[PDB]
Design a protein around this nucleic acid. Structure first.
Lengths: 52, 105, 58, 191, 122
RNA sequence: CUCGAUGUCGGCUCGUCGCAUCCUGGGGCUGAAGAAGGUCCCAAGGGUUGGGCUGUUCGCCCAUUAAAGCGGCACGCGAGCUGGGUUCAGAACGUCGUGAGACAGUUCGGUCUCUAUCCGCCACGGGCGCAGGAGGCUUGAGGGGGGCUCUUCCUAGUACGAGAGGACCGGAAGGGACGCACCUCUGGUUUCCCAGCUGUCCCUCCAGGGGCAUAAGCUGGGUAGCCAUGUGCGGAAGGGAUAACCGCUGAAAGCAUCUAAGCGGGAAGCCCGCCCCAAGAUGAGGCCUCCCACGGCGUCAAGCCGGUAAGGACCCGGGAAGACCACCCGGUGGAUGGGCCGGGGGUGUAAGCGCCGCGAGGCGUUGAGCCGACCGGUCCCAAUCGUCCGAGGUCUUGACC
């Protein structure tokens, strides 16, 4: 994928994946993805695998 | 905290000026490494390096003085550019086993 | 506000006994490097300057 | 020396099939010093110097098979401990020190409305009025960190030599890496 | 995780909305309701009287907790939310339908029923 | 006994007994088939949950549970909180009183004090001891820790059973509270490590910084150690002596009787076992590995001196070792600190120049720069040189060379 989108990344040959309601999702990564993303609009996201 | 630094600061400062001062055991034991460390930077020697060293010390004269001045007299070794020497006596009322330290020379 | 205070004249005896475990112990000092005399085990002095380097006065 | 033992390697888990965390342990054969027997009279420990080079800087199976390696010349490679086994190890607490009746000993402290009142840590009480002065009961700030700790059901998983070393099933060696580890599988229950 | 009066929504339709957590179901002591687990709470509020109704004595289970669940697969999983499903004494749901995904779990502790109803089980 | 004064309700915490035992095992009983109850004898190990409303305990109610025990110790605990409350003056009502005041009727609010001496408890050092002087290793008498449990499955839906049900017996698995330990995985830390920021003073103008804005001014984040929300693990077998309780062999009662004598059965319980000390248990224990008879003095001079690095120490340098202390490793024939150096980790690509846009900025060089303890090299630095103290080998009896 791309930490869902968070093109950064973090935590070994395992990692981990957060998640939201509605069969929707959020595979995941670092404390730079999280919080931010968990609170607005992905599009606008830069740094990473979006505003790449 | 802000004090740990401050120290290292003025001590690092004063010192380079003389190159061996009189503070107690510890005090010295540290002003070393640090100050020490700093040195190793005068050694690096450049835009950056300087922009640091100063960053703390704050002061052309020196800052430069060392980077150029001493730095060299050291360009060769491997840290240790300081020889922390304990002292014989002790500040009164107190009774603190002060001590002296210099730039190994 | 003296909640707790002794309760029975401490007994000289004991008292002192207490003050007993106390005691000094002369500076372990040694003798000059070449300074010739007795110095603070490990140091130059108003007799030295040496060690290996003349870092002092007199 | 009746047993087998060495020091703490460290911990980490990784792999398996579901995955599982253990701990590494260092120790070839720390030689063989005499051996336990109270024969003809009182016998226990001899010393026919054959040790290191420094050591004078300070100068019936378990024990049995020993005879095997302790007469060989001294040393004795560790590892019967094989594939899937339960020895037991006795670490050394951990210089944790003298602490408040808090962690030292489970207990609830200064509640709320007073769970702060520049108030806090400190036991509740000792003994009643009539009962009698005190008990040797309620612990106290009973220092820790030094205890001769250990445990049980210590299962070893695997081992290999490159350097004689052992992989463990759940670490909790007690003491810290580079620490003094001794193992055994005492009165095992999982047997 | 999830006891006293921590709240959690529905994903099924039982006719609920959210529910307060009384007891962690199992036996004495015990202090925790983690998906798969089964809770002894009630309605904090439920639709316009579907079939349940606000403040209704209840029984529900675990399927969504941001507490993070460590998968024997040294893996890790969690959710943006915390809620579960009602049940018929017979570990049997009511909501005819599901909502947000869930986790293998359930299966492991019985419930298929939802296991599949679920839009997606992670 | 106490008024030259023992601070009183409930709560909190920390608990400790006891058994008439609530849960828990073992039993005999039943109008007990099963299953589940009832009855009573034996056993306290362990254990006996969240809320609610009430100053309360008590108590009723809510959801659990095996269980949700009765009571001791001034209905334990104020020199340990609580301090709501009854129980200071206010002041209120109501209430009696000509009144004044008043009330186990009520209602608002109303100063619980830093320095433990002793005994006592938990802890760590100092002696002196254990009769050569010596470092290393073990025994444990005797103490202390810990023991609980639900549920799920086969046996089996077979015994029983008209049926709806549901076994001893025998065996898997999971989980609950709990405790020991531990960072790997997880999460909380991260007072400067790293990064973004607005206000300001110096900085030289720009840039590039600097304190202060607590003690970091603010925000994002962040090893290593500590630490849970998290990791392992534990409460078992089994051995012996019993409760109650069940039997055998058989008197006295030529017939019966667990019975005095003889022999066995039988418990979460005692003893043992499993961890945790531990001979200062003055009965100072064992054992191995070192050190040899030095001086001169009136004596059973077991008294004064060089010693033996056997050996230890002190001083230095260091430790998840740590208040001090004691305890551990090192002391330049060293890697012990720091230093440097690689390595990892961590911050998100720097200072500069460059190239796009009036500017703001961007894009590049550049996953840059900077890096606090984590893994490991290298004598740059700093553990130089030096002291002190330390044995000699007590008396009797005998067993062997």
């Amino acid at each position: 994928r791309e930490c869902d989108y968070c093109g950064t990344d973090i935590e070994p040959g395992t990692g981990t994946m957060f998640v939201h309601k509605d069969g929707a999702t959020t595979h995941f990564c670092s404390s730079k993805c999280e919080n931010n993303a968990d609170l607005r609009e992905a599009r606008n996201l830069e740094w990473t695998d979006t505003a790449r | 905290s802000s004090h740990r630094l401050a120290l290292y600061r003025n001590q690092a400062k004063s010192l380079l000026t003389h190159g061996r001062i009189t503070t107690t055991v510890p005090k010295a034991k540290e002003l070393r490494g640090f100050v020490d460390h700093l040195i190793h930077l005068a050694k690096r020697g450049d835009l950056h390096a300087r922009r640091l060293v100063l960053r703390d010390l704050q002061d052309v004269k020196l800052v430069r003085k060392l980077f150029d001045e001493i730095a060299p007299r050291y360009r060769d070794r491997q840290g240790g550019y300081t020889r922390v020497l304990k002292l014989a006596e002790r500040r009164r009322g107190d009774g603190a086993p002060l001590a002296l330290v210099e730039l190994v020379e | 506000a003296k909640h707790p205070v002794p309760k029975k004249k401490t007994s000289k005896s004991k008292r002192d006994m207490r003050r007993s475990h106390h005691a000094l112990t002369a500076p372990n000092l040694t003798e000059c490097p070449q300074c010739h005399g007795k110095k603070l085990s490990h140091h130059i002095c108003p007799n030295c300057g040496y060690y290996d380097g003349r870092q002092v006065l007199a | 020396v009746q047993g087998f033992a060495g020091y703490k390697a460290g911990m980490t888990p990784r792999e398996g099939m579901e995955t599982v965390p253990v701990t590494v342990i260092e120790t070839p054969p720390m030689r063989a010093v005499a051996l336990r027997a109270y024969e003809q009279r009182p016998l226990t420990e001899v010393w026919t110097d054959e040790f290191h080079s420094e050591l004078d800087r300070t100068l019936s199976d378990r024990l049995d098979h020993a005879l095997d390696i302790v007469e060989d010349g001294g040393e004795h490679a560790m590892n019967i401990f094989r594939a899937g086994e339960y020895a037991d190890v006795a670490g050394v607490t951990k210089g944790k020190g003298t602490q408040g009746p808090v962690k030292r000993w489970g207990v609830q402290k200064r509640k709320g409305k007073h769970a702060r009142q520049g108030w806090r840590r400190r036991i509740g009480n000792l003994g009643p009025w009539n009962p009698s002065r005190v008990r040797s009961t309620v612990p106290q700030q009973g220092q820790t960190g030094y205890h001769q700790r250990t445990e049980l059901n210590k299962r070893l998983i695997d081992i290999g030599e490159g350097g004689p070393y052992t992989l463990v099933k759940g670490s909790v060696p007690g003491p810290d890496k580079r620490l003094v580890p001794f193992f055994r599988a005492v009165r095992p229950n999982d047997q | 995780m999830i006891q006293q009066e921590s709240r959690l929504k529905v994903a099924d339709n039982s006719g609920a909305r959210e529910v307060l957590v009384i007891k962690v179901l199992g036996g004495s002591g015990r202090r925790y309701a983690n998906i798969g687990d089964v809770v002894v709470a009630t309605v904090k509020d439920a639709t316009p009287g579907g079939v349940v109704k606000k403040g209704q004595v209840v029984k529900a289970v675990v399927v969504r907790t941001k507490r993070g669940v460590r998968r024997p697969d040294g893996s890790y999983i969690r959710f943006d939310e915390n809620a579960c499903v009602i049940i018929r004494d017979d570990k049997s749901p009511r909501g005819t339908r599901i909502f947000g995904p869930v986790a293998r779990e359930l299966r492991d502790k019985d419930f298929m029923k939802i296991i599949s109803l679920a839009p997606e089980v992670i």
